Amino acid sequence: MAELACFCYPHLENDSYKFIPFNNLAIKAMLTAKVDKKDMDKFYDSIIYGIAPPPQFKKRYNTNDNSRGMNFETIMFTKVAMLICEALNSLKVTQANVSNVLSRVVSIRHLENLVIRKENPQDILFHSKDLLLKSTLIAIGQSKEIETTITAEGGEIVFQNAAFTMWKLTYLEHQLMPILDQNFIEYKVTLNEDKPISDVHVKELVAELRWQYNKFAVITHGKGHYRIVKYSSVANHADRVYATFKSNVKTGVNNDFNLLDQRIIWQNWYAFTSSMKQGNTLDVCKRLLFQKMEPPFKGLSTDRKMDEVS
Amino acid sequence: MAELACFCYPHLENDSYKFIPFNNLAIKAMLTAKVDKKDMDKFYDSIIYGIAPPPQFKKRYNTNDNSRGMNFETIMFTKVAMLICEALNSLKVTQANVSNVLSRVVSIRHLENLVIRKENPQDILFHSKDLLLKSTLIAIGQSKEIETTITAEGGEIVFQNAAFTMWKLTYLEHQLMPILDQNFIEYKVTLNEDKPISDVHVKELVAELRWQYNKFAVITHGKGHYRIVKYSSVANHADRVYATFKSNVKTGVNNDFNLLDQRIIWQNWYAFTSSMKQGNTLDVCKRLLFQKMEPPFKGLSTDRKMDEVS
Amino acid sequence: MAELACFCYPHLENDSYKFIPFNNLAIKAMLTAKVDKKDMDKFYDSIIYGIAPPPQFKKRYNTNDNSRGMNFETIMFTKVAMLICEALNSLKVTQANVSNVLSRVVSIRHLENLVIRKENPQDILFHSKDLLLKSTLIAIGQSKEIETTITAEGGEIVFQNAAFTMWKLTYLEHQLMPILDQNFIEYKVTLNEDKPISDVHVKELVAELRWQYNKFAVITHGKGHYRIVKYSSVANHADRVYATFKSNVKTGVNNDFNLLDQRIIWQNWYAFTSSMKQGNTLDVCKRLLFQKMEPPFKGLSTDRKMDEVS
Amino acid sequence: MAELACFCYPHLENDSYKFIPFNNLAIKAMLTAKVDKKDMDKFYDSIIYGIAPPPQFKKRYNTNDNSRGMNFETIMFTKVAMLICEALNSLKVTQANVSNVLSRVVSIRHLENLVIRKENPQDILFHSKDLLLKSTLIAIGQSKEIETTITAEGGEIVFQNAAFTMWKLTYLEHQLMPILDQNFIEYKVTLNEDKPISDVHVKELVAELRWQYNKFAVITHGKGHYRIVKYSSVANHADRVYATFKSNVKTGVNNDFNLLDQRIIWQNWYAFTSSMKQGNTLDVCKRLLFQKMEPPFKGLSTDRKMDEVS
Amino acid sequence: MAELACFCYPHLENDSYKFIPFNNLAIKAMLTAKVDKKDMDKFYDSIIYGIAPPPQFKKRYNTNDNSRGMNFETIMFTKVAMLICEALNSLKVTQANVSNVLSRVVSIRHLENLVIRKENPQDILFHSKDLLLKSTLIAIGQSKEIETTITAEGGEIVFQNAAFTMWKLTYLEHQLMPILDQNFIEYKVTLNEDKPISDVHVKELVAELRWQYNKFAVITHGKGHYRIVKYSSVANHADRVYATFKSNVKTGVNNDFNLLDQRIIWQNWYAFTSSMKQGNTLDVCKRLLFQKMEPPFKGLSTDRKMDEVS
Amino acid sequence: MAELACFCYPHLENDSYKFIPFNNLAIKAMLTAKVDKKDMDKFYDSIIYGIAPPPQFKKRYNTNDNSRGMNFETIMFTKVAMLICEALNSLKVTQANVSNVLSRVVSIRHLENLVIRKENPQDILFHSKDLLLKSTLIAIGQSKEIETTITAEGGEIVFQNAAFTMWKLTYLEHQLMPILDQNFIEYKVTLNEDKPISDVHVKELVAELRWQYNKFAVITHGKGHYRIVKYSSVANHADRVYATFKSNVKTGVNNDFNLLDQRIIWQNWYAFTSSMKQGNTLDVCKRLLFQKMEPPFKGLSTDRKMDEVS
């Protein structure tokens, strides 16, 4: 969604790098500037409003002629920028790394959701700076830890178990970078703890997903939680995860992929992703997606049905 | 929902009975009137606003202390009343029958929907008085004919086949007697013609109902069309149909019941209703409703799924 | 409330007097005019907008400095004027009488209510010009007939009997000359027919008046119907009726007074008015109003009570 | 209206139990949760929003499919919860009792009214924490003291005496759990002090109740104040008080009942309740309610009448 | 923008084909229908709302999941449909041709503009059915005649000459199929007559275009008028015209192209299009577009400048 | 736009003059006052609201009969007054000078823009009192320094270079003294630093001005920055600058004039102003304005064009 350099810039004071949010009028000035090709990757001095992002990220910002960026003039842009700065400032980043850290692309919608979590007095993140930092570092790609319920990006809870918390992603209502397609619906299921889950608690989740979300495929991107996406979108999900798997192999970055419970994941998605982890090609993997198959917890849908009839 | 006498009264002119709509201020005057117990079943003379319904039907009309009636002061009350009068006036009803005809209870919501159909220049009923009369006579219980797509009460079309037309019932938005429970959702599937339906056209309907309405039971009330109701409501439907079957037996009125296609109807509903037609008791019939069973078109849900994934 | 000359003027065409409504801009011009004392009682020629009422009636019209008149610029002024003209035009008034007819003071609020009745397709007056004329002639003081339910000024029906129709007077919502005191509440009870009324139908009315209007006195002005007025106002009613009785004696005009049913009228009002008809003085009559007395249908209030408890 | 456990949960810190209000998002999470039958009576851990009420109280909370509960997402829910917690926290409740204390059902509308009293700088409760605690403990069922004017739940004062304060209950306008029937009207009359009341001060109250509330029955529930309820509702009041009297006998809880002044209470209610205290059956008691009788302060209604006529 | 079959269907009555507009509820029903692959190109019978377009044109209609179609539920859809039907009905189309006529793709925005012209009493098209037919037949591709000012699609006149009329295209404000990109600006310059144009009248147009539209390229699509498009869009225009030139060659349809005045057209566009007419390839033509060149009416921009300074 | 005495008055406390803002009700009182001709130039004592400006400046203030002044009752009047007072209070003005300082006419719109700059946390002036003072002293005519980008009056940045910052003047939206002509558009180009500017950075600015502002003349008033004004206004600009040049010569005040870069300034303006500096008459100077001439960076407009076509 955007590189971290779209929100802040590094400032060396006291043999350590502190990160500072952009003023939105500085971004606005940048968008109107004539800049040499040699300077497109350098931070821009607006003179009146402080420093601004490198003009090379111009398309990340919505303008009269760009709707595929972010709304950098909203309050949420500043809140997201401050959330990034706080997390990155706790890391005492060193001179060799600042470039890699800022050039990293992160999910803006994940960050706006964490803002929404932390500003809510009811939410644990409002009351624990440690959990907020952990949660943010995960979304910034500066942590090895896995996103769980405690550290979830958030949303509206629509189902909860001893083992699982199902959330509805509210991206349509975001201020910074909302999803523009009004047909969008996506959920995620995060794990509450990391100790083994009983068959009965798996059953309960599977049963809810077949009754209340029968038109949704249960998939994962390998990062330790389930993604509940409409079947009309799994093919696009497959492309993205494969491209991400392929790239992370070429670049040597961490590339472990948690296929998660085969009793829960859509069987075609399990096939597709298991073929990925085996090193197969895109065309070979994607074929298992569209290949019909039928070999699960039998009779779970008819249980919820009769419960309702009573 | 209400007896026909709640909308019109009979007037003998020219050796034939013409039916006349009530003024709503006549109803209002009636609701404030002191009436002898002997006159509760007689039409009421408001003096200023003409005749009014028998005070015995007071509860059919919404007031400060009644919300289970109709909104007789709306324009829709008059349109519905005129629709009834037109249909009943084409029948040259005779002196012995007027009582039975008016005392008959009909669905107001069905009549408001027929009004909505006929006032729409796009709808065939707007352009054929014969079809409108047929359609209304069915809803008034003064016709032996079966409601089909052509003569359907109406609603929003949400699926259509060579053989079927699926409608969404808009009762939440009615003016005269809307459903007050905002959780209400109900569809009906009417037959387009009365010649046999191919297996493939049945398949197409069943497939849509499992994909798009998996949380809905396919039942019928025996009147020749399907009713798509949430499982949380089939038990109440069962009570009503049985009470109607029981009564129509005691009173000798027509009591044929079309169970419709067993490949479409929910198997528990087919069992429940087949036990009814065999003369069983309520407790025996209703038991087959809650009795779990599992012995259909196999693999039809997985067909639509893969179609979407493409 | 206003003389008839405030609404129309006489025009002699074809040896008969036709009456013509004023344009409101003609009235407005009149209100700004300098007029000789000798011409204050003559109709005024606005030149641009036709004839206008005699400047002597200036205070009948609301202005920046008068709120005790009528709102002669509303549509209702024209409707009321036309209603008067129609009634007076059916009388072929003669040259000697026009002065007396126009100088007569009538109730504007009664006339606005008759307009409201006749413009309503539900009301009998909408469909019978004869009843409308009769009803208007009563309110214009050009008829010997008594106002009954059929010819009532109107309002909201709040109770109805075989013998009685109780109306709520809506004067607070009038456009032409509303009551300005927002605490105003007044009802009237008109007789449906003029044949004798049974004890049971009297009982029913008395019972309603004690239960639902316990804070209201049942009085009459002698014109053949009951007036339901709050006790805080009967003394003012007494003054007005006496002044009207006194005047009608001095002027020889008709002065019969129908005391109506002593089982219904408030006993103090019956005493007050019976003393009037006997020729007593104001001070003697009014004393019987404030004189406490207690000598009715016993136990009628406790009947309605227990009915409600059930 | 709801058990205290619907608002707070107990926390053992420092050998004493402190009570903590629920976050409304914790309640919301609970309402979506799959819970074992064995855990339905245990407080629920929403993980993200803290603890929540036992899922067994699900129906106390309004949802898309429940309107007979409370609006737990309003600000008033939190204010009411804090009011309960403050009162219960002053009691140093012990481990054996917490269950009984929380399981106790209290009037939410009484608690919302006490909130409205205490937040008003004009009200004595705003300025005396001791009176507020006393007043709340009465409404929580954790006090032996009787509700008087000082500690009344509140409302709009509509009549006041040396001995009495009459209040109108504003339940239609409540935010947390309003009465939904718009025809609802109920008053209460609380005693200002507990020393004897003169006949003249009783007379004054009775006189107001007959003039201004003639359609209302003067009853009590035995808790030391009068309840002014429409006659159309006394039968339902009778059922509730008897069921409460019956239960409190079976459970041994305090069951004294103050019949209050027989010159004020509706004579049928006095009969009904006196039969209750004598141990009679429901059918025997309730019969005295509908039994007509007529054997009071004579001529008090005619005093207020003549006062108004002046 | 859409085939003519998206608006009407043919009906053989009286050995001639009359064309009939679709009801929008018929289209809506079609969009929900299950249709055999063999019938996708056949007109669809909605049963309740008449005939509908072939389901193969589903994407021409805006839905919850399609924004690249038209708003067929607006009034403008019906007006456009009637305009097409009127024009096509004057042609007595024969059985062999109906398919070709309906399958023809036309500009909806051109048709909505002609509607706007004809409904305006000020516009000549409102008063001449012959001119309207001519104008529509041009936009329907059923006429050999060239669009001139008289028969222009319309818009806001922003400049006019003895020889030229410049219009602003209002596509952003259209109801049926507006341009969605809010940055859109496009003008057209139509010829008033077809007799030769003096150098001075060309000068006047060129002068206005350089002063008031310096950021716009003067191009044509070969149909006899100028198109004033921003330079940021000429490359896309080039693609479309070439694809249209290429296709019309392969299909043998009329393919004459009027390059128009080389003193007016942007020199790069003249080069690009002259290379097209010579049969060159796309890559060869398009190269002349981006090839810088500079060899016009000298000093025309400085004339308007000094005029303004005065 | 107004003398400084329209905003504040001098107060001698502690052998130094402090300047105090006017209350707007003091101004209002002054505007209603009868004042001797001898006192028209003295500050006015409103008695109730403090001191007010000399009645001789009455026309500087908008009233029912004056629209060519300022809106002295807005909040902006007070902010501007305080900004002046702060700047003037840092100068320890002496007794001989106060008259000259206050009588000085300054641009109100410049001062309102500096307020808008300083109240914005994003703007450097918000964070540096020294820069704000410098910037204000320039606008007050109490500084020898030249307005640069850092100290610019402000506006919306529409173009920025290593060497230049182009601003749009928002005078239409001002609160204190907006431009009333809605056709007004004016920009200014300020220099970022005062070290020499490369040819390439000049080229970049000239290129933007020809593409995006072709209808605007590049002129200066000699104060060290460029003014981008429509050609329809340069003649009026010429009058004003000449009158200012003429006056400053007669009064001996500073009269240096920076013609700025002849490669940027409109050649006619350079001629006009160079003739001014040579001492020529108005008629001689102004003639060079309207005199056509054509002898610049060739082919710069065609560079931006082709860039857009790509």
Swiss-Prot record, chains A, B, C, D, E, F:
Compartmental location: Host cytoplasm
Active site residues per record: H225 (for ntpase and rtpase activities)
One Gene Ontology biological process: viral genome replication
Binding-site positions, ATP: S107, I108, R109, K188, H221, G222, K223, R227
Keyword terms: ATP-binding, Host cytoplasm, Hydrolase, Magnesium, Metal-binding, Nucleotide-binding, RNA-binding
Entry annotated with the keyword Metal-binding: yes
GO function terms (MF aspect): ATP binding; metal ion binding; nucleoside diphosphate kinase activity; ribonucleoside triphosphate phosphatase activity; RNA binding
TM region(s), chain numbering: none
Documented EC number(s): 3.6.4.-
RNA-binding: annotated span: 205-241
Principal location: host cell
Cofactor(s) demanded: Mg(2+)
Function: Participates in replication and packaging of the viral genome. Plays a crucial role, together with NSP5, in the formation of virus factories (viroplasms), which are large inclusions in the host cytoplasm where replication intermediates are assembled and viral RNA replication takes place. Displays ssRNA binding, NTPase, RNA triphosphatase (RTPase) and ATP-independent helix-unwinding activities. The unwinding activity may prepare and organize plus-strand RNAs for packaging and replication by removing interfering secondary structures.
Subunit annotation: Homooctamer. Interacts with VP1; this interaction is weak. Interacts with NSP5; this interaction leads to up-regulation of NSP5 phosphorylation and formation of viral factories. Interacts with host DCP1A, DCP1B, DDX6, EDC4 and EIF2S1/eIF2-alpha; these interactions are probably part of the sequestration of some host SGs and PBs proteins in viral factories.
UniProt similarity note: Belongs to the rotavirus NSP2 family.
Record's protein name: Non-structural protein 2
Species: Rotavirus A (strain RVA/SA11-Ramig/G3P[X])
Upper lineage: Viruses, Riboviria, Orthornavirae, Duplornaviricota, Resentoviricetes
